[PDB]
């Protein structure tokens, strides 16, 4: 479920070959992590937005379906708005990581 999302991250981290900056987190406190995912999930769509691509929409969509349902809240967490702003590269990768944490849980 969480493992499916990794594979999808690659397709895109590809299909992309630019863009701008997304809100990313790696200071990922286990205890603040479902919030981190939500932020990631939103941001993710910023790619569909910029990309006219059909295939990547279908991909982020597949990913959201997985993620959304997996999740289905916490305290003291950082808002999305107050996250680091990284590249389409670091975001993706930083996504990959936060999925892993979910995995080991």
């Amino acid at each position: 479920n969480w493992v499916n999302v990794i594979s999808d991250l690659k397709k895109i981290e590809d299909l992309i070959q630019i863009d701008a900056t997304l809100y990313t987190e790696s200071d990922v406190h286990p205890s603040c992590k479902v919030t981190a995912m939500k932020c990631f999930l939103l941001e993710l769509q910023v790619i569909s937005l910029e990309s006219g691509d059909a295939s990547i929409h279908d991909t982020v969509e597949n990913l959201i379906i997985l993620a959304n349902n997996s999740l289905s809240t916490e305290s003291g967490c950082k808002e999305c708005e107050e996250l680091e702003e990284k590249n389409i590269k670091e975001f993706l990768q930083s996504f990959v990581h936060i999925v892993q944490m979910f995995i080991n849980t």
Partner: antibody, heavy 125, light 102 residues
């Protein structure tokens, strides 16, 4: 191709209710959300609120929170807007728009794309 | 807060101001008898299918919609939006009717 297709023009009396619908096509209605905005004739846009087509969680605008009820039907890929105790000044075209937020926290970073044709609502006694 | 009225000649570069007191600002174009459509998001960004001509900027305590290369097709109402983090609500500029002259 993505579409939102809403219901037809309505005519209502004060104190009455309207239920506007908003049918979604071309995507996973349920992975996302719907935002409702309205426009009094010859006037501006005002956001009514929002709903996650995923969890049914909602967020109402203060101005409407007392009379709106937004819902969705995963099965018919339809969001609904219900405004009650209709008053005169509720006369307005009501729109729906896809909204990337399935979760309330995300909703602050939202954009509305695309939009339904809209649904004229006239409140006349 | 935006001017209710804006004028422009074809090929002209025009500007629409959305001011106030400071975060992110969005732009929507409502062609005459249609529903609004997303023009600009997160201040600067253009969703796919939104012409170069269209660009947004934020400066001081006020963002604006720079629309160049002007055409008649561009004749519409432009609404800026933002999210009142204090009210936890979305709010809209009052709008700016834009007339392309002929």
């Amino acid at each position: 191709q993505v579409q939102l297709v809403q219901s037809g023009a309505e005519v209502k009396k004060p104190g009455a209710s309207v239920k506007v619908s908003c049918k979604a096509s071309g995507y996973s209605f349920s992975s996302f959300g719907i935002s409702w905005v309205r426009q009094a004739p010859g006037q501006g846009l005002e956001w009514l609120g929002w709903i996650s087509a995923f969890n049914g969680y909602t967020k109402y605008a203060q101005k409407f929170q007392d009379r709106v009820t937004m819902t969705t039907d995963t099965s018919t890929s339809t969001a609904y807007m219900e405004l009650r105790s209709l008053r005169s000044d509720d006369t307005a075209v009501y729109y729906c728009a896809r909204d990337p937020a399935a979760w309330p926290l995300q909703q602050s970073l939202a954009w509305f794309d695309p939009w339904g044709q809209g649904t004229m609502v006239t409140v006349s006694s | 807060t935006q001017p209710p009225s804006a004028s422009g000649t074809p090929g002209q570069r025009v500007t629409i101001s959305c001011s106030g007191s400071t975060n992110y600002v969005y732009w929507y174009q409502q062609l005459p008898g249609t529903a609004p459509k997303l023009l600009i998001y997160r201040d600067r960004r253009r969703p796919s299918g939104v012409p170069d001509r269209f660009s947004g900027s934020k400066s001081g305590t006020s963002a604006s919609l720079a629309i160049s290369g002007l055409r008649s097709e561009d004749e519409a109402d432009y609404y800026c939006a933002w999210y009142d983090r204090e009210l936890s609500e979305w709010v809209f500029g009052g709008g700016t009717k834009l007339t392309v002259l002929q």
